[PDB]
Amino acid sequence: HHWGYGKHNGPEHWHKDFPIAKGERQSPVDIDTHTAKYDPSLKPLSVSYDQATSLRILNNGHAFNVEFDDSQDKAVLKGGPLDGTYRLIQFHFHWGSLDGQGSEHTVDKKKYAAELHLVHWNTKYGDFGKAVQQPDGLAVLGIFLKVGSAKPGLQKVVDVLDSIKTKGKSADFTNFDPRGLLPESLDYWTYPGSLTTPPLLECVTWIVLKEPISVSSEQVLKFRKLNFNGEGEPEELMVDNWRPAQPLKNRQIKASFK
Ligand SMILES: C[C@H](CNC(=O)c1ccc(S(N)(=O)=O)cc1)Cn1ccc2ccccc21
Numbered sequence: 001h002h003w004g005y006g007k008h009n010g011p012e013h014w015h016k017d018f019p020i021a022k023g024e025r026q027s028p029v030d031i032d033t034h035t036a037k038y039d040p041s042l043k044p045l046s047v048s049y050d051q052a053t054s055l056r057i058l059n060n061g062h063a064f065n066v067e068f069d070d071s072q073d074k075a076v077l078k079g080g081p082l083d084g085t086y087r088l089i090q091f092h093f094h095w096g097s098l099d100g101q102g103s104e105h106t107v108d109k110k111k112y113a114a115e116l117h118l119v120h121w122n123t124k125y126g127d128f129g130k131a132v133q134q135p136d137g138l139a140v141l142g143i144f145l146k147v148g149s150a151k152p153g154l155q156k157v158v159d160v161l162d163s164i165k166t167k168g169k170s171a172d173f174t175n176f177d178p179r180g181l182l183p184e185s186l187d188y189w190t191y192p193g194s195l196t197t198p199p200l201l202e203c204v205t206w207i208v209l210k211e212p213i214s215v216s217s218e219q220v221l222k223f224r225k226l227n228f229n230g231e232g233e234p235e236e237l238m239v240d241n242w243r244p245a246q247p248l249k250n251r252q253i254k255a256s257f258k
Pocket residue numbers: 117119128129130132140194195196197198199
């Protein structure tokens with residue numbers, strides 16, 4: 001009954017409707033810091049979010065998405081391993097029921113409390129739906145969250161969550177600046193992978209920042225009060241909406257830093 005994160009519809013079941021779940025470039029993966037190799041040729045990342053235009057925040061029954069106007073080159077990601085320009089379309093998070101779990105990527109098997117995904121699509125393919133059909137169609141910037149001090153730039157998100165508690169609810173979310181979600185450093189790891197939710201398409205260049213951001217226990221607690229279910233249905237807390245690490249197979253993770 002439709003994919004999700006429960007025992008009966010979660011990641012171990014997805015391959016039955018989405019056989020690519022057992023494919024050759026699936027995500028997330030464990031990042032072994034002792035095996036990833038510094039790649040001198042990797043350029044600095046270029047994150048150009050000054051003109052970002054956020055529109056709306058939506059509870060889609062799996063996570064919540066903050067959506068952006070991507071009709072023009074307003075907020076873009078360039079550089080690093082990428083050729084060409086990738087437009088920001090949305091961001092969302094994955095998080096746990098407990099502070100010791102929640103991220104999708106792991107670092108030397110360490111799980112973080114949550115993981116932010118800023119999703120961008122390659123403008124050479126004209127639209128997002130065409131881009132997801134291409135091996136170089138998407139670039140997702142992944143940022144780990146640990147519990148510590150509050151992240152001021154996240155609070156606007158946390159405070160609107162009460163208004164999108166259940167699946168299908170949305171709220172206006174204009175004038176949000178995603179630059180407030182970044183850590184200081186843009187050092188990263190990169191590897192070719194996939195969407196981490198169905199349809200699990202193998203269209204993503206992953207760029208995972210090495211420095212986590214800190215959020216407060218109160219901030220992540222509010223994530224955990226969201227609901228997977230729709231209004232009027234039995235309450236199922238939106239927690240543990242993460243896919244575990246998948247086999248690396250014939251892939252190398254490259255580091256931008258020594
Ligand atoms: C694949 C798309 C739905 N999924 C996503 O957009 C998506 C993005 C990022 C991740 S992650 N967790 O890996 O960062 C996972 C899922 C549906 N879809 C198909 C065609 C299409 C056209 C326009 C809009 C949506 C469209």
